[PDB]
Amino acid sequence: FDRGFLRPFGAKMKFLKPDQVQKLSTDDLITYMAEKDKNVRDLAIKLRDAKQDPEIKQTYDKAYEKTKAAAEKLVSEESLTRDALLKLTEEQYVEKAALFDKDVYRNNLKRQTYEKLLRSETDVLYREVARIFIAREGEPALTAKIERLALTLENNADTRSKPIDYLAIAADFLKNQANLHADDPELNLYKAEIKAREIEANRAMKEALKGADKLFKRN
Amino acid sequence: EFDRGFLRPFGAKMKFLKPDQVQKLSTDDLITYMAEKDKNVRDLAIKLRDAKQDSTTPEIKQTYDKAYEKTKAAAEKLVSEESLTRDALLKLTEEQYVEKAALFDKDVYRNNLKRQTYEKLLRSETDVLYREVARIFIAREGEPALTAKIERLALTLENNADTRSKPIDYLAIAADFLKNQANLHADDPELNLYKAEIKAREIEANRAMKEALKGADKLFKR
Numbered sequence: 315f316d317r318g319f320l321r322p323f324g325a326k327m328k329f330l331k332p333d334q335v336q337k338l339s340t341d342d343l344i345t346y347m348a349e350k351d352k353n354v355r356d357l358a359i360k361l362r363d364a365k366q367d368p369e370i371k372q373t374y375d376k377a378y379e380k381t382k383a384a385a386e387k388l389v390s391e392e393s394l395t396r397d398a399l400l401k402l403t404e405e406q407y408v409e410k411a412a413l414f415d416k417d418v419y420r421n422n423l424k425r426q427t428y429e430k431l432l433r434s435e436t437d438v439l440y441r442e443v444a445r446i447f448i449a450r451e452g453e454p455a456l457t458a459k460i461e462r463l464a465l466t467l468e469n470n471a472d473t474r475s476k477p478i479d480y481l482a483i484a485a486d487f488l489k490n491q492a493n494l495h496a497d498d499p500e501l502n503l504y505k506a507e508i509k510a511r512e513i514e515a516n517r518a519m520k521e522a523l524k525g526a527d528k529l530f531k532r533n
Numbered sequence: 534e535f536d537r538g539f540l541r542p543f544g545a546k547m548k549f550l551k552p553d554q555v556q557k558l559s560t561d562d563l564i565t566y567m568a569e570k571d572k573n574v575r576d577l578a579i580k581l582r583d584a585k586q587d588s589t590t591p592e593i594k595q596t597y598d599k600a601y602e603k604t605k606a607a608a609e610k611l612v613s614e615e616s617l618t619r620d621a622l623l624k625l626t627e628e629q630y631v632e633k634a635a636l637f638d639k640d641v642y643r644n645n646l647k648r649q650t651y652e653k654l655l656r657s658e659t660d661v662l663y664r665e666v667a668r669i670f671i672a673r674e675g676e677p678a679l680t681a682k683i684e685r686l687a688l689t690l691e692n693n694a695d696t697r698s699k700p701i702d703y704l705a706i707a708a709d710f711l712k713n714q715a716n717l718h719a720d721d722p723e724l725n726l727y728k729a730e731i732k733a734r735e736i737e738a739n740r741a742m743k744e745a746l747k748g749a750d751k752l753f754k755r
Contacts, residue, residue: 315677320672320673322673323674324714324718324720326720326721420722427726427727430661431658434661435658447543450537450545451542454535495544497544498546499642499643499646500646501544503650
C-alpha cells in the first residue's frame, strides 16, 4: 500500500514551533500538516490517488498546488502576526496552536472527542425518553413540547451565539424534563451524563487555550 | 386528553413494595405496578389499551379479553410464589436475579438502570470511536489491511468464544480492536483516549452491576 505523505497508522507525531515548520521542504511540510490538519490530510489523499494516474498530468499538478497552498496557509507569516491571531475565535486560535504544540493538540483532540460523544449521547438518550414520553403521553404531546422548546430557543437566541440544532433542543428537553421530574432517576441520570461530557469538553477547551496563549502570547 | 391504560404519566415517581405486599395487590393495581418496571408488561399493557379503544363490536371484545389475560399472566408470573423460592431464584443468572429484585427495590432498580444505561452508551460510543479509527486506518494502511485485522480478531474471539458468554457482536470486535490498537501504539494519544473512554464505561457498568447484585442478595437473601 502507498501512502503519499501520510505517515503509517499509530506513528508518533512530530511537533515543531511555527518558525521551524516554515524552514521545512514543501514535501516535509505536507507530511507535517497532513498528520495534524484533516483538510491537508484529505487533500494529500486526493493528491496520492491522482499521483499514480496528458489532461490528467496537469490535474496532478493542480492537486499538488492545492495541498502546497493549504499547508503553507497554516504556517503563513501573515496568519502568525499578533493582529491576525487576535482576529481569530477561541476555537480557531486553539486549532492553530494544536499544529505546533503536543499538549495543545492532545487537549484540542480531547475537546473534539467529548463534543462528538456529547452529540452522540444526546441523540441516544433523547430517543430513549421519546419512546417513554410517546408511551405515557402520546406522539402529539411530544411533537408539541419540542416545537415549543425549539421556538423558545429560537426567540431567546443571541444573533452572536451558535445556531440552534438538534443537540441544543434535545439536550435542553432532557435537562428540563429531569428538573421538572426530580424523582425520576432515569431522566436525572440522562441529565448527569450530558453535564458530564459538557464539563469534560469545557475543561479540555480551557486547558487547550492555556497552552495556546503560552505558545503564541496573543496578549 | 390522551388515554394510558394502566401506564402512569411521564415522570411519575415509581412506587416500590416488597414481594409479599405486591402479591396482595388487585390485578389492576398489579398491572399498573409491573408496567412501570417491566418492559414486557408495559408492551402488553399498550396492546391491551389499543384493544379497549376498539370495543368502545362483540366479536372484537374477544381479542380484548385475550389481551387482558396475557397481561394479567405476565404480571402475576413476576410475583408467583413459585418463582420467589430460594431454589428457583438460585436457578436464575446474575442478570435475571437483579432484573427480578429491581421490581421490588428502589436502589436495585436504580443500579440496574445505571448498568443498562452505561451498556447502551458503551455500544453507541464504541461505534462512534471505531468509525473514527477505521477512517484513519483506511487512510494510512488501506481497506484490505483493516478487513484482514478485523477478520483475524473475529476469528481469535471465535476460537475463545466459550469465555464471552454474550455472543460475538459486531460492536464487541470493534471494542477489542480499539483497545488492542491503543496497546500496540502507546504513543498515540487518540487511540489511547478512545481506549480510556471505552474502559471507563465498562468500569461504570460493572460497578453498577455489582452494586445491583449486592442489593438483590440483600432483598432475596440467596
